[PDB]
Amino acid sequence: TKSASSFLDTFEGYFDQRKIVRTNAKSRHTMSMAPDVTREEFSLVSNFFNENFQKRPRQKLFEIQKKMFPQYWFELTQGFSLLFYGVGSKRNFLEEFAIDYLSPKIAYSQLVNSIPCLILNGYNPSCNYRDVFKEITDLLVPAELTRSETKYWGNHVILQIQKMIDFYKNQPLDIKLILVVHNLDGPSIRKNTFQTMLSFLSVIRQIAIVASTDHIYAPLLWDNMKAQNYNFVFHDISNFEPSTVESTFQDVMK
Amino acid sequence: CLRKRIIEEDQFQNVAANFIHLIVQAFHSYTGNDIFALNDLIDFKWPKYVSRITKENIFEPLALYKSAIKLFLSTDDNLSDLSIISKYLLIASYICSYLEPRYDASIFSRKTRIIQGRAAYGRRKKKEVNPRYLQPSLFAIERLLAIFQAIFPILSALREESLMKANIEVFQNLSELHTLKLIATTMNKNIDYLSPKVRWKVNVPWEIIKEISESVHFNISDYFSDIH
Amino acid sequence: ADAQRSHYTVYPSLPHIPFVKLLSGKESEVNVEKRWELYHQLHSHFHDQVDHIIDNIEADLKAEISDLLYSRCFNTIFLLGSDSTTKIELKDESSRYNVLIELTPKESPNVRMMLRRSMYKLYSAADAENDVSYDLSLVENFKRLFGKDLAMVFNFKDVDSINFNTLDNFIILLKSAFKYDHVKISLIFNINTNLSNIEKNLRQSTIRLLKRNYHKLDVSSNKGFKYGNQIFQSFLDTVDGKLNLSDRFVEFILSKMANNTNHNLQLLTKMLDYSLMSYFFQNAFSVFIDPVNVDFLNDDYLKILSRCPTFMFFVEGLIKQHAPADEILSLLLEEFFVEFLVRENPINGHAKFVARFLEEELNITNFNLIELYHNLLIGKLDSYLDRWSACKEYKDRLHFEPIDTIFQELFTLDNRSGLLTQSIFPSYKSNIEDNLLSWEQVLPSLDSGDLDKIMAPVLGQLFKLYREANMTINIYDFYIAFRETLPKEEILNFIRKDPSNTKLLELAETPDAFDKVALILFMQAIFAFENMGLIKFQSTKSYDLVEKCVWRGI
Amino acid sequence: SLLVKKYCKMTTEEIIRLCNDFELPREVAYKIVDEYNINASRLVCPWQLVCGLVLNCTFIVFNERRRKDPRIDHFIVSKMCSLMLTSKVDDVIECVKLVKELIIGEKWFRDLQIRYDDFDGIRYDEIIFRKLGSMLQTTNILVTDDQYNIWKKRIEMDLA
Amino acid sequence: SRTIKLWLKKDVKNVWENLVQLDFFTEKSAVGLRDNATAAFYASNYQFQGTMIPFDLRSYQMQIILQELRRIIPKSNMYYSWTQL
């Protein structure tokens, strides 16, 4: 079904491809004419093609991308948050960078255990901001709010993070926590309170932020204040990876 | 102020009462029968009326009215910095909110065709209701970005591709416009920005977008003169 | 499994600077550490001045609000372009409580919550230096409880975000306190858009109430360019005598600084910082901004510095001016490199000179020092000074021609590679579209080699058919179009390459094998497109048609 | 002006005559023939498409000569205005940009880009590090080693 | 055409607010004053769409129709002829 349009790109292509199709010019082709495929053969063919089709170019490209790892480390030490984007899964890249590379480098440069890496699976729709902050408060042990700081039915998480920001401004600038956020534009983490929480955590220089995004409209999530607080350096890392872990929360039959 | 004016250069009560009836005769149609609004107008226009009292005017009420006639033709009860991308995004959102999406190729399409085809002909007959008198329509993100690209200002040009694409600055400006509520959504709390079900609409009147377009020297009225 | 969890902490297993070795890895580690420490002193010297400038912004801005706030109606202050981050101070004024109340739109869902939070904060602040009801009778009983007079200063934060009906009703509520002789009320409005947008949302009687005494205050950092010029001058005095700034870089700074208005200074700081990191990470000649490293000259330094176009122009001018060939071959250098890296480059001091002459000798304040520096770089300072109609008599004193010095290309901040664009302000959706459409600029073409050679990756192959289609796509026709591009024989040979997998070998000899494989790959790529936001199902319970959402080049 | 003439008549012999005056390889010339043939019923001016096709192929095939000599890039379009009977050069680069939309993503164009190792004017090993945002990417404010070597050999030739 | 001062939009805004306040106009599909305190508490924590759009675009309905105005407005009024269509 190639379009009979003169244009493909820009607003010219946008206005030229949104024309009106008559009823007799439409196709009444349905999913009932498709060959029937069960879940098991779907799983079998997908894990065969995701492990043997274009695996060697993906391997060589991934070996090119780890030459960027010292530059990523240098951008994290100067206070910038890393945002990775591209076509394909970036989950293995983020855990391999943060765990196998970045945490021993930060721990050895700050001279004995390595830096803890808190992983946020934003592709999970059950990612909850209060339990993430519970894990953060166990990892960092911040001072609790006094009675005048609780305000009047305020959000205790946001007030505690603001107190944390005012505390950590007069501390040595040594990274105490590595916050990895797979799929920062995921279904529950893209909400306003979660983004506000994560940007205010990104204000703190002692927390390293390594995040990834999958949606094409992800920079719509951040206004001027959130872009100032996040302090992103953007890095395009396209690899055409399968993304099989993130697909377990959706139904592939539909 | 009155006793400073009589030293700088029953009848005091006469001129105060005459000012009160002049205020009432000038502004009763505007204030209605409101005691409070007329009291504010009296308090606002009393010192400017005292400041135009002369020796020729103190015993001549009509000439003193004509000397300070500007205070009675206008009520004057009022209190009288966006980026270039934010300004053009506001203009494009107004265009998307008040032009129906089936004739944009009849206005914005300008580029040379290699493949045979026809653009939109345009609207056949004009409507007789000004659409800016009604509530704004809803649009998608990509229509707003397409019209914003259409209306944004423009051998080394071979590798130039002189058309501004929606980079992160455009999306950041759009998000700033949403958090200022110059753009609005269909839902207000727990907003899913990345859902295609969520649509956008302009949230400014015609006067605000008019002075915004004159701030950037954009002819926004030319897109509305032929339509109605 | 941790992959199926919401969140989990990994205590990595621990089995020293991020700077790498340049000169194709032949740089010494001493030079790497010296580059690291040199970058740290330059970064510290810039950021100490930046912190002092930001502190001075805070101090002077609190001073202006404190002046305007002091010396039977509201005392209204409108702070235009505020962004509501400043801590407002109130003095100690004996026999009178000065209580400051911050209200955000999140703390203001209705008038009742505004009053309850305001009176709780008022009672808490009065007690801090028998329970009561948190209502306006606390205001009328304030001198009976605490003995002193009351001065409330309300600070409404993000006034463009609070519901205006609630704010109007709250101002009308606070009007009731005017009948008490021991109460004065000041209101501070953090206006972000403009004042005309605010008064069109308030009722006319409220505007008439607010008109009795109000003061406007432009509190933006863009007003007068007074704070941006100090940051840019601090960066200039950091790099004075060490690094040059290109006209391309300053033009980029101006163009990006125009696109952001509420947050301008930290964008400028971020751009200058990232340029400094990029220079000290990519350039091995950075050690030569310190004169003590001139004994660290090696061969690879000489062949890198011999490709400078200023050196190219200098030696071709030398063969233009000198007839004998013996002196030319002697230069084609190590001693000639040293004697020119210690030049003063007085453009920074002259920029400071015209800045202080424009500010303190001609009483002209509305100039951008970044734009003035760009005009001094391109050589058109007179065309920048002929605007105010007062530099006509001083046109000849402030003349400066640019001196294109030798070997300045090894010590400069530029953008001719687009690295600052790709890292700070990328074309995000355009990069996604171009990686989907092309894909040979992402995946290498190594020369299952046959199927990798002649079949595209599935997402790019789907995007090639997606882009050429209409707004509304039939899913079955899309699958038919996708199946035609695939090789029917090489795919069936590819799934028979592994003899260990038996169920795939069993499915391979089915007469409906290739269509099943094509439909599985098509459905996986379609759900990848749906998760990326490229397509949308325009239904709930059919999933037979999709709508295109994203167009390349928009 | 050959770019103005609407619905004009042409054969494959004129296509081979145009593709042989630019010294393209023969397989690229027949792919240009096939690309015109699969669009031939739907062009308002087929010389626009043909001009863009030969110009986009001759940018790719001689990428090395254009890198070591930029004046070839100032020659080829300057020659082709002599063949399209146009005085201004803006319509030729407009043809290049308009045809570039229609052949990007096509399989044979991508294979040509791979086998000449030319992706929007540069090799793969540079474009991958500009896509990654590497600080160590080979920016062009100096000259290359090959340009420096041939310049040094030329200046040593003209010295004696 | 067949004199009366034509007032500007900014001045007519105050007359419009006074007509809303005197219950001549009513917001479209407005419930108004709730029956019990629980419904009023539920309404007070909701942000109505009419309170965020600009005032010139709010839908309103008449508490008095044009026929009733023709019934009550005396014949000697200078706007009586416009109480008919």
Author numbering:
A (entry chain B): 233 to 343, 355 to 497
B (entry chain E): 214 to 222, 230 to 300, 323 to 396, 405 to 478
C (entry chain C): 16 to 30, 38 to 93, 100 to 157, 179 to 381, 388 to 502, 510 to 616
D (entry chain F): 271 to 430
E (entry chain D): 424 to 425, 447 to 529
Give excerpts from the publication:
The coordinated action of multiple replicative helicase loading factors is needed for the licensing of replication origins prior to DNA replication. Binding of the Origin Recognition Complex (ORC) to DNA initiates the ATP-dependent recruitment of Cdc6, Cdt1 and Mcm2-7 loading, but the structural details for timely ATPase site regulation and for how loading can be impeded by inhibitory signals, such as cyclin-dependent kinase phosphorylation, are unknown. Apart from Cdt1 and Orc6 (a subunit of ORC), all loading factors belong to the superfamily of ATPases Associated with various cellular Activities (AAA+). Here, we report cryo-EM structures of ARS1-bound S. cerevisiae (Sc) ORC and of the ternary complex with Cdc6 at sub-3 Å resolutions.
Our 2.55 Å resolution cryo-EM map of ScORC·DNA afforded the location of active-site water molecules (which were not resolved in any of the previous eukaryotic initiator structures due to lower resolutions) and a better definition of the side chain positions of active site residues. As expected, the conserved Walker A lysine of Orc1 (K485) bonds with the β- and γ-phosphate, while the Orc4 arginine finger (R267) and Orc1 sensor 2 arginine (R704) engage the γ-phosphate (and also the α-phosphate in case of the sensor 2). The Walker B aspartate (Orc1-D566) binds magnesium through two water molecules. The catalytic glutamate (Orc1-E567), a residue that activates a lytic water for nucleophilic attack of the γ-phosphate during catalysis, points towards the ATP γ-phosphate, its position stabilized by tether residues in Orc4, Y232, and R26332, and a bonding interaction with a water molecule in the magnesium coordination sphere. Surprisingly, the side chain of sensor 1 (Orc1-N600), a conserved polar residue in AAA+ ATPases that supports ATP hydrolysis by helping to activate the lytic water and/or by bonding with the ATP γ-phosphate, is flipped away from ATP. Apart from the magnesium-coordinating waters, two additional ordered water molecules are observed in the active site in a cavity near the γ-phosphate (W1 and W2). W1 hydrogen bonds with the catalytic glutamate, while both W1 and W2 also directly bond with the γ-phosphate. However, neither of the ordered waters is correctly positioned for an in-line attack on the γ-phosphate. Together, these findings argue that the Orc1·Orc4 ATPase in DNA-bound ScORC prefers to reside in a pre-hydrolysis conformation. Thus, we predict that the following rearrangements are needed for ATP hydrolysis: (1) a rotamer switch of the sensor 1 residue, (2) repositioning of at least one of the ordered water molecules in the active site for an in-line attack, and (3) a slight shift of the Orc4-R263 tether may also be needed.
